[PDB]
């Protein structure tokens, strides 16, 4: 039975509304782990609780190279504890952010990896994740995709059935999420082409600070690219970002078969993508199992401590979550 006694908490990674993320070590193991710790009170108090179980049955119910595993997941009468393996490359705004545009070819090698992860989502597990926003996409120690946090994902989406619910970040929803009245699984392929923007171009396809207004130019106005990117690589997010899901690559009954395929990815090997066998053209140069060095000192440099038998108390406010019992099978 795993407790917060068994790890040292070593670094602040980040922090939010709902909690932080702590780098960890195991003390039985020497293993190092982030530590997603969420506050149960404000997880109610928000109404993300169904968002936050459906996080863990899905972390719990798969497996893939880009996704991240989880380890253990526990709650005590306040918390709830997400231990996965750390994401040492930090995330990719941290390095886009900094770079401004990473090159097509590296752009063209993440979107493969999301691509391969959404495949299996979409096919394997009938899964819609529906937060593709560049914060979640990190890079794990080698320089490989880690798409992090399941909460918005829909279970039991199985070819073209619907969703309804409105949710995802402002600036990245599809056209038909806007719309509310319905959506398939092709909103996960406007994510992908968002991203994959954001990568190439260096900003977002579509921004305005009032809502309204953005939501009007994802509804309405035609993409634009930099004069710069290359005629492959604006045909795929010409596709990608189509308002119309049904005229969108990855829209049809192929699914991401039609992304894969186009010339974009022309002489990627599938198989190896998901077997890892392409070299990522960048190489997270951390020099120890602890080093934080992409993520921001705003977080690292902060003091971590204990709040900023009850092992069955069952409030309102502090529910004992079902399911938050996991080890994963060694
Ligand atoms: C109910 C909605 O709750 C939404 C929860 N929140 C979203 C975060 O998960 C976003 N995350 C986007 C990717 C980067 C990380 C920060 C560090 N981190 C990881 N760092 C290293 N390895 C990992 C391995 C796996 C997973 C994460 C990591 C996740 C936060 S937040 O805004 O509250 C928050 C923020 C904004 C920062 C830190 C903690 C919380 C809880």
Same mark, same amino acid.
């Given at each position: 039975?795993?407790?917060?006694?068994?790890? !040292?908490?070593?670094?602040?990674?980040?922090?939010?509304? /709902?909690?932080?993320?702590?780098?960890?070590? !195991?003390?039985?193991?020497?293993?190092?782990?982030?530590?997603?710790?969420?506050?149960?009170?404000?997880?109610?108090?928000?109404?993300?609780?169904?968002?936050?179980?459906?996080?863990?049955?899905?972390?719990?119910?798969?497996?893939?190279?880009?996704?991240?595993?989880?380890?253990?997941? /526990?709650?005590?009468?306040?918390?709830?504890? /997400?231990?996965?393996?750390?994401?040492?490359?930090?995330?990719?705004?941290?390095?886009?952010?900094?770079?401004?545009? %990473?090159?097509?070819?590296?752009?063209?090698?993440?979107?493969?990896?999301?691509?391969?992860?959404?495949?299996?989502?979409?096919?394997?597990?009938?899964?819609?994740?529906?937060?593709?926003?560049?914060?979640?996409?990190?890079?794990?120690?080698?320089?490989?995709?880690?798409?992090?946090?399941?909460?918005?994902?829909?279970?039991?989406?199985?070819?073209?059935?619907?969703?309804?619910?409105?949710?995802?970040?402002? !600036?990245?929803?599809?056209?038909?999420?806007?719309?509310? &009245?319905?959506?398939?699984?092709?909103?996960?392929?406007?994510?992908?082409?968002?991203?994959?923007?954001?990568?190439?171009?260096?900003?977002?396809?579509?921004? &305005?600070?009032?809502?309204?207004?953005?939501?009007?130019?994802?509804?309405?106005?035609?993409?634009?690219?930099?004069?710069?990117?290359?005629?492959?690589?604006?045909?795929?997010?010409?596709?990608?970002?189509?308002?119309?899901?049904?005229?969108?690559?990855?829209?049809?009954?192929?699914?991401?078969?039609?992304?894969?395929?186009?010339?974009?990815?022309?002489?990627?090997?599938?198989?190896?993508?998901?077997?890892?066998?392409?070299?990522?053209?960048?190489?997270?140069?951390?020099?120890? !199992?602890?080093?934080?060095?992409? %993520?921001?000192?705003?977080?690292?440099?902060?003091?971590?401590?204990?709040?900023?038998?009850?092992?069955?108390?069952?409030?309102?406010?502090?529910?004992?979550?079902?399911? /938050?019992?996991?080890?994963?099978?060694?």
């Amino acid at each position: 039975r795993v407790t917060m006694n068994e790890f !040292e908490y070593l670094k602040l990674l980040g922090k939010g509304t /709902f909690g932080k993320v702590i780098l960890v070590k !195991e003390k039985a193991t020497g293993r190092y782990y982030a530590m997603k710790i969420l506050k149960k009170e404000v997880i109610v108090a928000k109404d993300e609780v169904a968002h936050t179980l459906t996080e863990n049955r899905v972390l719990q119910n798969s497996r893939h190279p880009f996704l991240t595993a989880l380890k253990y997941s /526990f709650q005590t009468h306040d918390r709830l504890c /997400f231990v996965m393996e750390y994401a040492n490359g930090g995330e990719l705004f941290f390095h886009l952010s900094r770079e401004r545009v %990473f090159s097509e070819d590296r752009a063209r090698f993440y979107g493969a990896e999301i691509v391969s992860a959404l495949d299996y989502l979409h096919s394997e597990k009938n899964v819609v994740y529906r937060d593709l926003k560049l914060e979640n996409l990190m890079l794990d120690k080698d320089g490989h995709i880690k798409i992090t946090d399941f909460g918005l994902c829909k279970e039991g989406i199985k070819d073209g059935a619907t969703m309804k619910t409105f949710c995802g970040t402002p !600036e990245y929803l599809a056209p038909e999420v806007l719309e509310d &009245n319905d959506y398939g699984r092709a909103v996960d392929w406007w994510g992908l082409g968002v991203v994959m923007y954001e990568m190439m171009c260096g900003r977002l396809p579509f921004y &305005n600070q009032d809502h309204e207004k953005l939501f009007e130019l994802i509804l309405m106005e035609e993409i634009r690219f930099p004069r710069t990117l290359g005629p492959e690589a604006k045909s795929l997010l010409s596709g990608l970002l189509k308002k119309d899901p049904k005229q969108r690559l990855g829209g049809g009954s192929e699914d991401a078969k039609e992304i894969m395929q186009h010339r974009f990815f022309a002489g990627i090997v599938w198989q190896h993508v998901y077997e890892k066998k392409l070299s990522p053209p960048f190489k997270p140069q951390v020099t120890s !199992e602890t080093d934080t060095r992409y %993520f921001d000192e705003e977080f690292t440099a902060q003091m971590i401590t204990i709040t900023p038998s009850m092992e069955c108390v069952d409030s309102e406010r502090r529910p004992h979550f079902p399911q /938050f019992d996991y080890s994963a099978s060694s």
